[PDB]
Design a protein around this nucleic acid. Sequence first.
RNA 1: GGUUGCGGCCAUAUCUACCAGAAAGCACCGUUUCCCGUCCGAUCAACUGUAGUUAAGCUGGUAAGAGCCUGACCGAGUAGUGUAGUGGGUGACCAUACGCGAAACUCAGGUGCUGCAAUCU
RNA 2: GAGAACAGAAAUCUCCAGUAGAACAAAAGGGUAAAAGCCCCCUUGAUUUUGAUUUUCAGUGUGAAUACAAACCAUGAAAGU
RNA 3: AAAUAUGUAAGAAGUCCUUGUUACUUAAUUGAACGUGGACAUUUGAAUGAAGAGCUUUUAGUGGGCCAUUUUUGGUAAGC
Lengths: 52, 159, 169, 269
Amino acid sequence: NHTAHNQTRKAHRNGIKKPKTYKYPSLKGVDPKFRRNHKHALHGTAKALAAA
Amino acid sequence: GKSHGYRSRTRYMFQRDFRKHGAVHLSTYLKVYKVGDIVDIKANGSIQKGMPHKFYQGKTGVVYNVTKSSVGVIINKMVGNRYLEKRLNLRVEHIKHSKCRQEFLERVKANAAKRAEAKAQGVAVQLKRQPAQPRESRIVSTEGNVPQTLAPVPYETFI
Amino acid sequence: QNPMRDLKIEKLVLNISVGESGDRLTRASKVLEQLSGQTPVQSKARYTVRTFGIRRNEKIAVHVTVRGPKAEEILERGLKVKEYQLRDRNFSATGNFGFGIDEHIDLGIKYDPSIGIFGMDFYVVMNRPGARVTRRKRCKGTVGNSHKTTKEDTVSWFKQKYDADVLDK
Amino acid sequence: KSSAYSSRFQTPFRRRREGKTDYYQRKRLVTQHKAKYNTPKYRLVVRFTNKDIICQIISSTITGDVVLAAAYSHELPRYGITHGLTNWAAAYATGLLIARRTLQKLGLDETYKGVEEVEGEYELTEAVEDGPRPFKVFLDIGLQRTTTGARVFGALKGASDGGLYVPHSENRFPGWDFETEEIDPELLRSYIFGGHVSQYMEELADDDEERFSELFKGYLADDIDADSLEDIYTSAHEAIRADPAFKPTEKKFTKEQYAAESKKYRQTK
RNA sequence: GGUUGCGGCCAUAUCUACCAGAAAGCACCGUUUCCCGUCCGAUCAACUGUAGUUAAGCUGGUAAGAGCCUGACCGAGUAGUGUAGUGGGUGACCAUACGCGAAACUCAGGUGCUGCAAUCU
RNA sequence: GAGAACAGAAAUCUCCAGUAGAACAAAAGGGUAAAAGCCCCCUUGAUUUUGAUUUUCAGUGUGAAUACAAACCAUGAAAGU
RNA sequence: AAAUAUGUAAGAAGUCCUUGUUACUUAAUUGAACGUGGACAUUUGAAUGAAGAGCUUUUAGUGGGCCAUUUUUGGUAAGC
């Protein structure tokens, strides 16, 4: 009935791992009014630096 | 049976400090937050809209999303054998900036300044911190501080 | 002495606790209209007492608060019913005072043979000029100890006015 | 009371003990959208003392508020208004002065003239196309109670006529009938100029002819009759549009001779 | 330096009780025709700075004051507590070794500081 | 607490003190004083579209909440909500 | 208001200068986010260790547990 013996040893056998951050996190949870404009800003920056 | 509410076992955690009740002072609504700022989570029971859970009280996270009257933060949380990234939407009154970063930022500024000083002056400097080294040789003098002899103290009449 | 120091009258509230609710209540309303000129207001019941027969939220009493020049006129015609003989116990610790008459006809009104017979509660509160600092909204404050009105200053003003011979008992 | 009372007593804020600031109102007037990070949120502060009107434009930082532009009613003698400086028309002219002064400070006084020939209609400062948007200030009427026809909406009307884009509605201006839900512009214009003062002047000229002098003793001594108030306020508004820049009063002393005299009476330790 | 408007930190700012405020400001104050609101122009609204006053508000001093804040050869290296022993004791508990280490108290000191704009002998 | 005809322990009115000792539908805990309490006015955001997130958690469902987006509205002088 | 225990940070995905994008934001040629081009790339900004770091697929057994120190709750008390 919920004996927490051996659970920390089981947790620390295969390590307790960090979530492995990256550059460019996902824009799925951010403000959609900002994300809609950030799409157009990235597109305009790409079209500017393409013909340079 | 046992209960697991949203605010269970939270009697002392979400209560205002002694002689600190009432309205929130206006500095909290004027501190600005950008994406990437590291903030502490410290809820108050006065504003019930946008509270964190009782787990996240005291945890430090990184702002990922700024909108009207509330910021969203990212907190690693250990469940089982690994950490999960929890994204959570807090009002500003449960958020204080972390001053743990604003020693490192000013330290970067200071050592970049003295590194640019030394590399154009013609000397060598260290930029790493060091732990408390052992003490050095000193000659303790005896002019006013003549060593007063101490003795252990007896027990009778002290009782 | 000094201006902004005189115990000017502030308001005189006339009050009648009818105890019941009905035709004498509506009559006493017209009595206070014929006396004051202003329309009066009725008050509800705070609590419930079975032995006095009033329940929660029932209009039982009529009062009207008069100010300005007619307040001391009604005060004079109410004092000449008591023959200008007031007690010392009627004066409160904050310097306001009142009394109660048993017949409401002998003020100077005309008599009606149908509107009922009742007494009336006179109460008058007065203070020196400058008590807007408590009653206003922005920047409230309490009047100073030298400017507060007490029982001794009120009975001194009542002795100087009207040649009262207030009872000190 | 007790030691146990005074140890557990929590005093409120200082400008709440003084009774000067409503923090419940100030939170929502100052607190801004977090996605506009350092954008200042300007408040048109209108305050009424017993013989002066204070119209300031005020932003807010953590180290106290910051005044962008202020305009007082005791500089209206530079434009023509002498008597009745806590007037409805004087509140209008003060709001017009702070609007013209703020737009001259920013550089929008040529693009946003507002309305110049005022008839009392309800009209908001519409944005011009392919240019800058108008300056945006939010009015805050202190601890002052809002009633329809109050003086503090005269400064609102004056700022919106000067072209300061204060968002508002018409249902607190004088002349707004609560039955037809419509305003009377021929009454609002009569309050914008001197109509409700001048009408009382000509009524007291033949109803109580000494109380007329005891009220308008400055008007009779300065030879201002009832009908000239319109001509006073119109040329006053024209002078305000002409030169609204703020030049300070020339000081008698340079604030050290002031301090040397004020330290004499200050009763220090 | 005085004052006003808007403030920041929100008692070193509060509470209690006397005294003083030049100038300017603020305030009390004067009056209901109009906008407005009331049992009541008392609050609120409007008009006049005109008849008056520092009496109050406010500000500043004063107090073996209550509180509040700060500091330590204060309490005290005390209570508590992490680690160790085939330590002691029948036991409750205790001592020792390596560490961390309070609090109420006691004494001393203090009683708002400051930002923006305007104005004043 | 001090006062006022009947009127008192306890009906109505007036002043003074009053950091919440009241009230907030209901358990207990938290919160709240120009309010979140008490009165008054106007209303239907107790609405439409589906997403993201927190809690219990397998990071499944159910329940309940949180912050926005695109509409349409309410209220207020307004910021706002 | 401890002791023990606990979140985060200690840089190259960093810091600074300049000016490009945007339908977002601003009274605004303001800001936000992502950038271009330069500069610092020496101690790449505490200690110690690293016996490689990261990732994926698939599957067995298990899903009756007990004892000791310390804290503790029902319990007169236990090998409760």
